[PDB]
Every structure is written in C-alpha cells, then in structure tokens.
From a paper:
The fungal Bromodomain and Extra‐Terminal (BET) protein Bdf1 is a potential antifungal target against invasive fungal infections. One attractive target is the fungal BET protein Bdf1, a global transcriptional regulator. BET proteins bind chromatin through their two bromodomains (BDs), BD1 and BD2, which specifically recognize histones acetylated on lysines. We show that Bdf1 is essential in C. glabrata, and that inactivation of both Bdf1 BDs induces lethality.
We used a peptide array comprising histone sequences with diverse post‐translational modifications to probe the ligand selectivity of C. glabrata Bdf1 (CgBdf1) BD1 and BD2 (CgBD1 and CgBD2). Like other BET BDs, the two CgBDs displayed weak binding to mono‐acetylated peptides, enhanced binding to di‐ and tri‐acetylated peptides, and strongest binding to a tetra‐acetylated H4 peptide (H4ac4; acetylated on K5, K8, K12 and K16). Substituting a conserved tyrosine implicated in acetyllysine recognition by a phenylalanine (“Y/F” mutations Y166F and Y343F) abolished the interaction with acetylated peptides on the array and in pull‐down assays, demonstrating binding specificity. Crystal structures of CgBD1 and CgBD2 confirmed the expected BD fold (comprising helices Z, A, B and C), allowed comparison with human BET and C. albicans Bdf1 (CaBdf1) BD structures, and revealed details of the ligand binding pockets defined by the ZA and BC loops, including six structurally conserved water molecules. CgBD2 undergoes a minor conformational change to accommodate IBET‐151: in unbound CgBD2, the side chain of “YPF‐shelf” residue Tyr327 adopts a gauche minus (g−) conformation, stabilized by a sulfur‐π interaction with residue Met395, whereas, in the complex, Tyr327 adopts the trans conformation to avoid a steric clash with I‐BET151, thereby widening the ligand binding pocket.
Residue numbers in the entry: 301 to 416
Write the structure that this text describes.
Amino acid sequence: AMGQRAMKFCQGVVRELMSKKYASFNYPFLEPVDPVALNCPTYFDYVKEPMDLGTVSKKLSNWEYENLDQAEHDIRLIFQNCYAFNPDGTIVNMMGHRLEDIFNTKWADRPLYSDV
C-alpha cells in the first residue's frame, strides 16, 4: 500500500533512469533480457530474478511495491544481474556501472518515510 509521496518519488527515479538523455548507456536495461534473441542463451544459469527498468515502472504503477526499500531492491537487482552475467571491463558491465552511478545519486533524495 505505498503512498503518494513515495510513489511519485519512485516513478521520478525510474523515469530519470529511462530517459533519452542516458540512451547511449541505458538501452540494455529498458526491457526484459531475451536470451536467445540477444545470443546469450545461458543468461538464466547466472540470473534467477530478471529485472529491468520497464518492469519496475509497471510494478510501481500496479502498486506492487509495499515501500521504498522494496522498490530500491528491485532497481538494484537490475545492476546485480548485469554484473552477475557481464564481466568487468565488458561494455554492458560499464554501462551498468554508469547507470548505477546515476541511480545512487538520485536515490539519496528518497523520503525518510515510505508513506502508506
């Protein structure tokens, strides 16, 4: 039962991370990974909870997050999944760190209280 202030804040963070301003490095994180189409057929030997920014935005809009900590964890999972499958130094790994850098900056503005 997340409240309006927390909801608006979260949607704002997700909207920021998906915005075209970051298109040159956020495009791997906008939609669900498709292992076969991306020629990474072993993706789900490394990842067991897929998450992407579009999915966080849908769960948000469907009132599926109880509170801000829960939302933060789904967003953070996008990047843990990235590093679980893409080694250091690869392009997608580095894109993930750059987008996470922005997430870290934006998330520190969160309301102290996750209203209900």
